[PDB]
């Protein structure tokens, strides 16, 4: 029964995962629970003003994807794949891209 497979999922995940990654997996959940609720609003009240909806939504999707990219560049299991990238360079890049994102959404929110 699927509840049993989910139990065998969480029994692993909670044991296997460094704390700095659980932190990210909670931040991603906050992002996703904000974006899903913006969407459920948009399709309840209506598309106007499409500018502000599309800005706040793409701001959520962008912050989610930048968080997943941090969640992947920093993971030691991928050091063989992102050669030459230290965790600190990945964090500087994450703040660079998040700065561009929060500038352009501020262009588009209005």
């Amino acid at each position: 029964s699927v509840v049993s497979v989910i139990s065998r999922f969480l029994e692993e995940y909670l044991s296997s995962t460094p704390q700095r990654l659980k932190l990210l997996d909670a931040y991603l959940l906050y992002i996703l629970l904000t974006g899903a609720l913006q969407f459920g609003y948009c399709l309840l009240v209506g598309t106007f003003p499409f500018n502000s909806f599309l800005s706040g939504f793409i701001s959520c999707v962008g912050s989610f994807i930048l968080a997943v990219c941090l969640r992947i560049q920093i993971n030691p299991q991928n050091k063989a794949d992102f050669q030459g990238i230290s965790p600190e360079r990945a964090f500087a890049d994450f703040l660079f891209a998040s700065t561009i994102l929060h500038l352009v959404v501020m262009n588009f929110v209005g």
Binding site: V5, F82, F108
Partner: protein, 685 residues
Amino acid sequence: SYEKQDTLLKLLILSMAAVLSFSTRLFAVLRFESVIHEFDPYFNYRTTRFLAEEGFYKFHNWFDDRAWYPLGRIIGGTIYPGLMITSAAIYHVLHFFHITIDIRNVCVFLAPLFSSFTTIVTYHLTKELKDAGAGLLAAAMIAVVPGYISRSVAGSYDNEGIAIFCMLLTYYMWIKAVKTGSICWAAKCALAYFYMVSSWGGYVFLINLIPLHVLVLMLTGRFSHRIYVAYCTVYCLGTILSMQISFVGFQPVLSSEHMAAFGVFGLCQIHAFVDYLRSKLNPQQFEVLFRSVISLVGFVLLTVGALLMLTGKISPWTGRFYSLLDPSYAKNNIPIIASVSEHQPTTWSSYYFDLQLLVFMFPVGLYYCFSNLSDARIFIIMYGVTSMYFSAVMVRLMLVLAPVMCILSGIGVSQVLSTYMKNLDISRTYPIKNEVASGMILVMAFFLITYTFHSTWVTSEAYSSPSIVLSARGGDGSRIIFDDFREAYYWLRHNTPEDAKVMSWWDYGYQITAMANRTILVDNNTWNNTHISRVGQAMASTEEKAYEIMRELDVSYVLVIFGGLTGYSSDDINKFLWMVRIGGSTDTGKHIKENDYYTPTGEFRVDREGSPVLLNCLMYKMCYYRFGQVYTEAKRPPGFDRVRNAEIGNKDFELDVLEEAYTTEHWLVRIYKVKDLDNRGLSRT
């Protein structure tokens, strides 16, 4: 030390390539003048000098009431401003140092500068695909490639000058991102994309090639986390940046031209998550969830991908881009797009004429990219194979093909040279192998020299003639010049009321607006086909009926271009059939039928055998007024037309609602004043 000599030889080669790229485009300035060519560049020039004078915020808000009277045009809402912003920035930088260059010169010489920078961008872009020895070849090839020069000669101030620089810079940044897997390079690729989106309408090509590359990397099973980070970052950033441009608006989200990228984004997420669950669960515990989850989320996507189209909520393909997917559409559905002979499909002759050696070397660069596949080389394979098709659909797009043709020809020739030059490593059948290698190296040197002489000949003879001026050679070989276009526009500029409205066919609208500074009815950017049809109906209709339209639109003057005294084949008489078609295309025009102007035999001719409606339309009467008595040639009777090679049929007539205001020295341009309403209420019959 060896490193010094390698660096010296790289620097020397690249600086010669840059100097050649800049210098080969000057032929047009040396032959005539530092002046802007063609029709379309004049709108870019006027808008650039506007931005250089009024400042950004007044250019962006700018609304122009001198064009498309009485509708006007929203300029900043309907333009790609990147070229103008670039020119204004360079202008202000030079003026800051008090290098007070005239803005016209900055515009004229802007294209050579960026067509020099593209040689360095092409060097690095090829170096990252192969080695520096291939990048030097690709630079030297793209320096002179005539297909690119054809759109980039000095004074050819049009977007295609900047677009290929932004395009190659975007491909360099994307290749760096995919090779490296770094968010920094993804954000720099997003900024390069945003720059390109601001500067040319062809950005849809990149936002449709990159998703296809990612898809091909998935199907091959090469997809790995570097591609996920690159794609999802380039997608979110380039989307929210491209949506900034007011002419782009919501199209990146609400148009089927961009849904390929969103589909690949969603499928990247599904694949990145299945790759994780398959890594956590055991097979017997994975398979049930795998098949169930796919049988739900695939069904969701399969439904939404239908609903989006069936509702029409996602806009369908625009007729232009669809005419790129189906060559037959525009010739049946939009005669404006049909009328521009630049949209004809490409024959083998133009491929040889514009590329020569590259046509022979491109399959070898492809053979190398297929021999040594890699996650970055699949990009160049896809770019090549896509441009090879789209260039065949429409000659104008050869510009997009020339860069990849040069990169692949450079890879191929590099692989040949570096193959055979290894057999010449004597210095630290063997004599046969050495003479074979020497002969093949000589053959390659010979080919590369012939490519230089071909490209220089083509650049000199074909693509360097202007079009605001006409040229001929007298029997002594002196250049005869006809300036009649500028003479007529200057006469308009000085000797007519400053509020007068000049009616003209839509080709000349940018010229009248730039040189004459008078209001016009219709213009090259045919954003209102109804208005163009309303002008064609007035040109094609009879002189009694056309007056009601000219008085309806409050016209002051009408201008026609007549070649029959000089053999200028591009006159308004040849355009007449297109003016008839467009005038009859609107429902208000159904009395205008093309079959009425042909003779019963089914031919168009203006001599005595011509249709009695053709001989009485407004345009024929404007072109051939008084002309019937001109001794056009010594062996020909009076009224011989140099272009139809026919003696006109209706020689003597009076104009009743127009008076001849000015006919230029060679009659090349004729302008009439539409007579004011008769003072006594008499009818004009």
